[PDB]
Amino acid sequence: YHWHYNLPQGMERPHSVNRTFAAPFQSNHSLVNKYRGVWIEFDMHPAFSVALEPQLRKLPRGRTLPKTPAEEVIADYTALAPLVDDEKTRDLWLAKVFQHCAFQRCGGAMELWERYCHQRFTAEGATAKPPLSLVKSVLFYCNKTDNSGWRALFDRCLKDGWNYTPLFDTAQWSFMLKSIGRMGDEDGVRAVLEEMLDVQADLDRVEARSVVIALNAVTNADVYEFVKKYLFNFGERKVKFLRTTYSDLRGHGAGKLRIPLKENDNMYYHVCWHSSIRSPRQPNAKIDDIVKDKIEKWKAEGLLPEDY
C-alpha cells in the first residue's frame, strides 16, 4: 500500500520509456518559422546578378516582395532580355517576373510563355528540357490567376516527360488543388491526386482549405467513387480537420475565400460520413425462374382466376 520510512528507500526498478518509444514531434500548432509559400530556388551565376541588379531589384527575392507594378517588369524583360546571351540567365529572369505577376494577379503574363519558352519546350515534341525554376514559377502563376494553361505543363512533368513531380514541394500542390477546385475540373482533380499518391507527397500536410475546395468540385459519378477510396489515404487527424474546414467554408466562414464555393451536398454528406467512420464511436436469371414457376402454379391452383 505504501513504503515505510525505516525501509531502505532505493529505486525499485528503472524505467526506460523514452528510449523504447522514440516519438516524433507532434504539435497541434503549425510551425511559426516555415516559409508558407512556393520557393523558386534562384541560383543565378554571380556575374549576371550584379549586372541585372537594377532589374532584379524590383523583383521578389528571398522573403521580400517589392510592390512594383507588373507592367514595368514586363517591359524590362521585353527590352533587356534579348541583350543577355545566356540561356539559363533568361530562364531564371523569366521565372521571377512570372512570380512577380502571380503575387499581383496580372493575367496578361501568359504571353511571355508563348513568346519565348513555348516554341522550344512545349511545341511539336520539343526535346529541350526547361529548368525546374521556370516550371515552378509558371505553375504557381497559372494557379494564382486561375489560368487554364497548367494542363499542358502538368502533363509534361510526368515520368515519361520532364519528371519534375518528385521535385515539387508540399506548398506547390496546395496552390495547385485550389485553382482546379475553383475552375471546376473533375478530371483535373483526379489526375493531380493520382499524381500526388504516385509521387508519395505529404498528403497529411497539404493545406486543408485547398483540399476542401478541390473536393467540392467533384460532381462526376466515376470520379466521385475515386474520392471515396482516396479519402482513406489521409490521416485520422487530417480527415477530422477536413470536416471542420469544409463545414465552416460553406457556413459562417465563407468570407475567407475570394470566390464563394458551390453547393455540393453529396460531397458534404460523404465527408461528414467519412469523418465519423474514422473517428471512434460516441444470380438474376435463376431467381427470375423461381417467381415465374410460382405464378404458373397459382393459375393451376385457381388462386389467380380468369375473367368472371
Partner: protein
C-alpha cells in the same frame, strides 16, 4: 491519492517520422549520385585530354612539363597504367627532378578517386577510405610506388654528382620522396600498410635518411590501421620528449583513428580532452569527425554482461554530444564542416539529449504527456524496440563512556507508547493488533 512514479522520465518527443527518415535516405542518395557524376565527368575529361595529346601529337614531341602535368592528373584519377609510359620516358630523357618525383608518387595515392570513395562508398568514414582504396589495384600501385622510388634515388645520385659518401641520403629530397612513398603505401592494401613501420622504416634507417614530422605521422597512421596502439603512442612519446615544437594535428588524428579501430573508446576520450586542454595544434574538422564517430560506434555497441535486461546501456554515451559540440564552438571548429552521414547522427543525439529553457517550461504539460500515451496506444507498432520482435586508524581499543554529559544538553521528550497487555495471560500474543506497532 495514488502516488506518481518519480523514477519515470518525462514524456518528450525524441525521434523522427518515417517520411523524414525516408527523405533523409532519399536526399543522401542524390548527393552520392552527384559525387559519382562529378568524378566520371572529370575522369572522362582527362582521358579525352590523354587521347588528344597522343593522337594529334603523334610525331610532335611535347614539352616535358605538359606530359608531367598530364601524368599526375592520370594518377590522381586512379589511372596509374596510363601514366607509367609517360614517367618512363621522362626519366629516360632526364627531365624529372627532385620535386617532380615526389609529385608523382604523391599523385599515385589517387586523391581524386579517394574523394569519390569517401562521399559514396566509405559513407564519409576517413578510416574506411584507406580500407577501400586498397582494393583498386593496391598491390599494383605499390609496386610502381617502389619502382618510382628506385627511379627517384637513381636520379638524386645523378643530381648530386662535400658530404660525398653521405649524398643524396642526407638531403631534403630523400626524405620528401620517402614521405611521398609512405603516403602512397597507406592507400594500398593491408600488406603494404604493415610494411610501412617495419620494412620501409628500417630501409630508411639503413639508407641513413633523416626523417621529418610527416614521416612519423604516416608511420603512426600505419600502426593505427593495424590496430597496434602500444607502438603508436610510443612514437608520439618519442616526439613528446625530443621534438615537441613540430608536432602537428595529424599525429592526434592517427591516435583518434587508431583507438576507434581497436575499439578502446576510453582512450580516444582522453586524447580529445588533451587536445581541448592544450589548444595547440588547432583542432581540424577531421578531429571533430574522428572523435564524434568514435562516440557513435560506442553508442551503437551492444553490451553482453547484463545482456540488455531492460534497455541499451551504451546509448547514454550520446549525452556527451552536446558537450563536445559546445567545446567546438570555443575551439573555433565549425560544426557545418561535418559530413552528412555524421550530421544526421549528431542531430539524432541532439533531439534525444538537448532541451532549451523555453521548452523546459513547457515539456511537462499534461497535453503533451497524454499525447505521448495515445500515440503509443495508436501506433506503437511503428516505433518500439519490443514490438518488432574517534580516528579509526589510531583507535584500536575504543574509549567507551568518556563521561560526556547528556544532561547538560536537553532532549527530554523521548517518550514511547507501547501496546497494552504485552505480558497479560488473557491477551494473545499474535493478532491483528500487531499492525498497530507500525504507526507514527
Amino acid at each position: 491519492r495514488k502516488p506518481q512514479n518519480q523514477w519515470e522520465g518525462v514524456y518528450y518527443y525524441s525521434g523522427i517520422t518515417k517520411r523524414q527518415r525516408h527523405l533523409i535516405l532519399l536526399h543522401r542518395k542524390r548527393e552520392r549520385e552527384a559525387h559519382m557524376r562529378s568524378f566520371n565527368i572529370s575522369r572522362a575529361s582527362v582521358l579525352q585530354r590523354l587521347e588528344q595529346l597522343s593522337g594529334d601529337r603523334k610525331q610532335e614531341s611535347l614539352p616535358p612539363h605538359v606530359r608531367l602535368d598530364l601524368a599526375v592528373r592520370l594518377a590522381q584519377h586512379g589511372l596509374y597504367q596510363q601514366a607509367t609510359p609517360i614517367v618512363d620516358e621522362l626519366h629516360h630523357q632526364k627531365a624529372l627532378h627532385a620535386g617532380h618525383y615526389a609529385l608523382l608518387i604523391n599523385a599515385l595515392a589517387c586523391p581524386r578517386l579517394g574523394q569519390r570513395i569517401l562521399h559514396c562508398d566509405a559513407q564519409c568514414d576517413p578510416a574506411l577510405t584507406y580500407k577501400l582504396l586498397g582494393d583498386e589495384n593496391g598491390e599494383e600501385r605499390a609496386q610502381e610506388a617502389y619502382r618510382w622510388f628506385d627511379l627517384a634515388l637513381t636520379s638524386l645520385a645523378v643530381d648530386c654528382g662535400h658530404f660525398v659518401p653521405y649524398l643524396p641520403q642526407g638531403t631534403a629530397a630523400a626524405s620528401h620522396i620517402t614521405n611521398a612513398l609512405m603516403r602512397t603505401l597507406l592507400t594500398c592494401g593491408y600488406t603494404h600498410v604493415a610494411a610501412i613501420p617495419d620494412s620501409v622504416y628500417d630501409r630508411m634507417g639503413s639508407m641513413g635518411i633523416s626523417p621529418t614530422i610527416s614521416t612519423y605521422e604516416l608511420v603512426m597512421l600505419a600502426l593505427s590501421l593495424q590496430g597496434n596502439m602500444v607502438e603508436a603512442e610510443s612514437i608520439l612519446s618519442f616526439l613528446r620528449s625530443h621534438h615537441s615544437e613540430h608536432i602537428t594535428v595529424e599525429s592526434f588524428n592517427a591516435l583518434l583513428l587508431g583507438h576507434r579501430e581497436a575499439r578502446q573508446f576510453d582512450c580516444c576520450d582522453a586524447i580529445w580532452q588533451e587536445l581541448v586542454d592544450r589548444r595547440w595544434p588547432r583542432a581540424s574538422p577531421l578531429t571533430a569527425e574522428l572523435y564524434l564517430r568514435s562516440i557513435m560506434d560506442h553508442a551503437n555497441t551492444p553490451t553482453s554482461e547484463p545482456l540488455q535486461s531492460f534497455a541499451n546501456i551504451n546509448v547514454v554515451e550520446k549525452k556527451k554530444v552536446p558537450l563536445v559540440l559546445a567545446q567546438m564552438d570555443e575551439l573555433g571548429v565549425p560544426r557545418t564542416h561535418l559530413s552528412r552521414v555524421l550530421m544526421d547522427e549528431v542531430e539524432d543525439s541532439l533531439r534525444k539529449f538537448q532541451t532549451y529553457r523555453s521548452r523546459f517550461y513547457e515539456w511537462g504539460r499534461a497535453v503533451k504527456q497524454f499525447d505521448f500515451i495515445e500515440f503509443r496506444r495508436r501506433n506503437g507498432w511503428l516505433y518500439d524496440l519490443h514490438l518488432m520482435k574517534g580516528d579509526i586508524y589510531y583507535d584500536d581499543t575504543r574509549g567507551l563512556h568518556d563521561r560526556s554529559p547528556t544532561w547538560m544538553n536537553e532532549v527530554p521528550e523521548t517518550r514511547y507508547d507501547r501496546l497494552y497487555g504485552v505480558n497479560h495471560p488473557d491477551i494473545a500474543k499474535i493478532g491483528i493488533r500487531r499492525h498497530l506497532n507500525v504507526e507514527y
